Design a protein around this ligand. Structure first.
Ligand SMILES: N[C@H](CCC(=O)N[C@@H](CS)C(=O)NCC(=O)O)C(=O)O
Length: 106
């Protein structure tokens, strides 16, 4: 499918998206951080394997409010939510950790 990873544009968009009754996966990244830019293509592959989960990316330098509120400091950080509730966090570009956190909750 096309359009599987959406880029967040406001804090309010994030707050709404994470409230969904499904797993919502959010890639927190920064363009100056290479390791963090590696999460996008990985998440693109995972989104097709777990289409029942929603996938998003968030540039912390555009949406620093969301980063601070969710206590994200290290780039990349993947945060996983279900029903407004954080169910997992994976810091760093760690494909197996991220995939299994997804598979557990999707
Ligand atoms: N996880 C590191 C790269 C990730 C990294 O060095 N992140 C830096 C920027 S690319 C960072 O967010 N440091 C923040 C901190 O002080 O916790 C790796 O093994 O390649």
């Amino acid at each position: 499918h096309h359009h599987m990873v959406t880029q967040f544009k406001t804090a309010s968009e994030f707050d709404s998206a994470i409230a969904q009754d499904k797993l919502v996966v959010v890639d927190f990244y920064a363009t100056w951080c290479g390791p963090s830019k590696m999460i996008a293509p990985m998440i693109e592959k995972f989104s097709e394997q777990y289409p029942q989960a929603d996938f998003y990316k968030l540039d912390v330098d555009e949406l620093g409010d969301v980063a601070q509120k969710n206590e994200v400091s290290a780039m990349p950080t993947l945060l996983l939510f279900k029903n407004g509730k954080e169910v997992a966090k994976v810091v760093g570009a760690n494909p197996a950790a991220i995939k299994q956190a997804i598979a557990a909750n999707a």
